Design an enzyme around this catalytic site. Structure first.
Site, PDB file in Angstrom:
ATOM      1  N   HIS A  41      28.420  41.609  34.269  1.00 26.84           N
ATOM      2  CA  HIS A  41      29.425  42.633  34.582  1.00 26.84           C
ATOM      3  C   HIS A  41      29.523  43.614  33.431  1.00 26.84           C
ATOM      4  O   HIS A  41      29.743  43.201  32.298  1.00 26.84           O
ATOM      5  CB  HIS A  41      30.788  42.006  34.851  1.00 26.84           C
ATOM      6  N   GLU A  64      28.695  35.591  41.022  1.00 30.37           N
ATOM      7  CA  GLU A  64      29.956  35.722  41.714  1.00 30.37           C
ATOM      8  C   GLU A  64      29.682  36.370  43.038  1.00 30.37           C
ATOM      9  O   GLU A  64      30.071  35.849  44.090  1.00 30.37           O
ATOM     10  CB  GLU A  64      30.951  36.509  40.874  1.00 30.37           C
ATOM     11  N   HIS A  86      30.345  41.271  30.017  1.00 30.12           N
ATOM     12  CA  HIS A  86      30.382  39.803  29.960  1.00 30.12           C
ATOM     13  C   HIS A  86      29.508  39.205  31.082  1.00 30.12           C
ATOM     14  O   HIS A  86      28.925  39.944  31.871  1.00 30.12           O
ATOM     15  CB  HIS A  86      31.821  39.292  30.069  1.00 30.12           C
ATOM     16  N   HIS A 138      37.563  30.866  28.530  1.00 26.60           N
ATOM     17  CA  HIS A 138      36.885  30.760  29.836  1.00 26.60           C
ATOM     18  C   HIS A 138      35.515  31.446  29.873  1.00 26.60           C
ATOM     19  O   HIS A 138      34.705  31.172  30.762  1.00 26.60           O
ATOM     20  CB  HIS A 138      37.772  31.296  30.962  1.00 26.60           C
ATOM     21  N   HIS A 185      29.035  35.776  34.078  1.00 22.92           N
ATOM     22  CA  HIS A 185      29.502  34.579  34.776  1.00 22.92           C
ATOM     23  C   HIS A 185      28.306  33.664  35.025  1.00 22.92           C
ATOM     24  O   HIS A 185      27.197  34.135  35.249  1.00 22.92           O
ATOM     25  CB  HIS A 185      30.179  34.950  36.097  1.00 22.92           C
ATOM     26  N   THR A 191      37.789  39.601  39.154  1.00 17.72           N
ATOM     27  CA  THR A 191      37.379  38.327  39.745  1.00 17.72           C
ATOM     28  C   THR A 191      38.107  37.105  39.157  1.00 17.72           C
ATOM     29  O   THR A 191      37.876  35.965  39.579  1.00 17.72           O
ATOM     30  CB  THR A 191      35.860  38.128  39.653  1.00 17.72           C
TER      31      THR A 191
HETATM   32  C1  LIG Z   1      45.018  40.412  31.232  1.00 17.12           C
HETATM   33  C2  LIG Z   1      43.912  41.371  31.599  1.00 17.12           C
HETATM   34  C3  LIG Z   1      44.154  42.734  31.720  1.00 17.12           C
HETATM   35  C4  LIG Z   1      43.132  43.623  32.005  1.00 17.12           C
HETATM   36  C5  LIG Z   1      41.817  43.192  32.181  1.00 17.12           C
HETATM   37  C6  LIG Z   1      40.711  44.189  32.415  1.00 17.12           C
HETATM   38  C7  LIG Z   1      41.570  41.805  32.087  1.00 17.12           C
HETATM   39  N1  LIG Z   1      40.252  41.315  32.305  1.00 17.12           N
HETATM   40  C8  LIG Z   1      39.555  40.424  31.519  1.00 17.12           C
HETATM   41  O1  LIG Z   1      40.076  39.722  30.654  1.00 17.12           O
HETATM   42  N2  LIG Z   1      38.209  40.388  31.798  1.00 17.12           N
HETATM   43  C9  LIG Z   1      37.483  41.262  32.642  1.00 17.12           C
HETATM   44  C10 LIG Z   1      37.007  40.854  33.892  1.00 17.12           C
HETATM   45  C11 LIG Z   1      36.252  41.738  34.655  1.00 17.12           C
HETATM   46  S1  LIG Z   1      35.542  41.186  36.178  1.00 17.12           S
HETATM   47  N3  LIG Z   1      35.160  39.631  36.035  1.00 17.12           N
HETATM   48  O2  LIG Z   1      36.554  41.281  37.187  1.00 17.12           O
HETATM   49  O3  LIG Z   1      34.320  41.906  36.359  1.00 17.12           O
HETATM   50  C12 LIG Z   1      35.994  43.028  34.208  1.00 17.12           C
HETATM   51  C13 LIG Z   1      36.481  43.435  32.975  1.00 17.12           C
HETATM   52  C14 LIG Z   1      37.219  42.559  32.183  1.00 17.12           C
HETATM   53  O4  LIG Z   1      37.970  43.032  31.151  1.00 17.12           O
HETATM   54  C15 LIG Z   1      42.614  40.919  31.797  1.00 17.12           C
HETATM   55 ZN   LIG Z   2      33.298  39.465  35.454  1.00 12.64          ZN
END
Ligand SMILES: Cc1ccc(C)c(NC(=O)Nc2cc(S(N)(=O)=O)ccc2O)c1
Ligand SMILES: [Zn+2]
Length: 257
Positions: free
Chosen positions: A116, A103, A91, A61, A93, A196
């Site tokens: 982010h 976002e 990362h 994604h 978006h 998010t």
């Molecule tokens: C399964 C699982 C457990 C724990 C985490 C942290 C995730 N998160 C991610 O895969 N991505 C992510 C998204 C954001 S965001 N888009 O909300 O800023 C920030 C940090 C990130 O690591 C998934």
């Molecule tokens: Zn993010």
């Protein structure tokens, strides 16, 4: 299994993840007339060690740039935190067109992309896995990205995408300080929010920069150039990965300025 498509996208997320309709969901529309200035907000202090940069990964994604998080070499402090938070990832978006892609939105205005920079509470917790679901577990810096001039600081990131073109592909990504991607003014909004995308934990204190950074229309095409399919399958471009804004549900957005 979740995504940003018709059947697996943001709309269906509550089927598997009921917190999607929670009271601390991200992202939100920041209404500047409705924000409350807060004189107790300290300045944001970021101090990252380029040696903590580790790996770039195509997650299907999106793509993630991960950081070694065994010690406090790369930390966030100040703002609304008394605790120190440890850098683990950054990362982006983006959207299908230049018109949308961020976002967060400010006074209904959509930007083209959003950076982010994510951290976890190493003062209170022992790991990311432990922190990830705690109310005070995560701190994410959000930077709005406005289509305009080519961002040169974005270069090393975009160059590395050639090695991780298809789902699950990963490569070393070393000696990078991501505070070089941050805007010169660190004036910010802050509010209690969430991840998010799934699993959507309400664990994030958001830090939203007032000042945007640039990105060119061609730099955005490089993001959308990444493939969501595995090597050998026919190409499915990563067109967009932004969640629509969520009701504030009486939360209050604080401004540092
Ligand atoms: C399964 C699982 C457990 C724990 C985490 C942290 C995730 N998160 C991610 O895969 N991505 C992510 C998204 C954001 S965001 N888009 O909300 O800023 C920030 C940090 C990130 O690591 C998934
Ligand atoms: Zn993010």
């Amino acid at each position: 299994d979740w995504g940003y498509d018709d059947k697996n996208g943001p709309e269906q997320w509550s089927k598997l993840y009921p917190i999607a309709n929670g009271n601390n969901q991200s992202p939100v529309d920041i209404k500047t007339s409705e924000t409350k200035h807060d004189t107790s907000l300290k300045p944001i202090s970021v101090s990252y060690n380029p040696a903590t940069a580790k790996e770039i990964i195509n997650v299907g994604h999106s793509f993630h740039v991960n950081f070694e998080d065994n010690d406090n070499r790369s930390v966030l402090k100040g703002g609304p935190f008394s605790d120190s938070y440890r850098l683990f990832q950054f990362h982006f978006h983006w959207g299908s067109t230049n018109e949308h892609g961020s976002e967060h939105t400010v006074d209904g205005v959509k930007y083209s992309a959003e950076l982010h920079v994510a951290h976890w509470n190493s003062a209170k917790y022992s790991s990311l896995a432990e922190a990830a679901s705690k109310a005070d577990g995560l701190a994410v810096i959000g930077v709005l990205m406005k289509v305009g001039e080519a961002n040169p600081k974005l270069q090393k990131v975009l160059d590395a995408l050639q090695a991780i073109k298809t789902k699950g592909k990963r490569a070393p990504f070393t000696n990078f300080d991501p505070s070089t991607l941050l805007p010169s003014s660190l004036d910010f909004w802050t509010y209690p929010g969430s991840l998010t995308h799934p699993p959507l934990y309400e664990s994030v204190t958001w830090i939203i920069c007032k000042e945007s950074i640039s990105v060119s229309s061609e730099q955005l095409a490089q993001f959308r150039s990444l493939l969501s399919n595995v090597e050998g399958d026919n190409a499915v471009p990563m067109q967009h990965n932004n969640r629509p804004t969520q009701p504030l549900k009486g939360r209050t957005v604080r401004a540092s300025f």
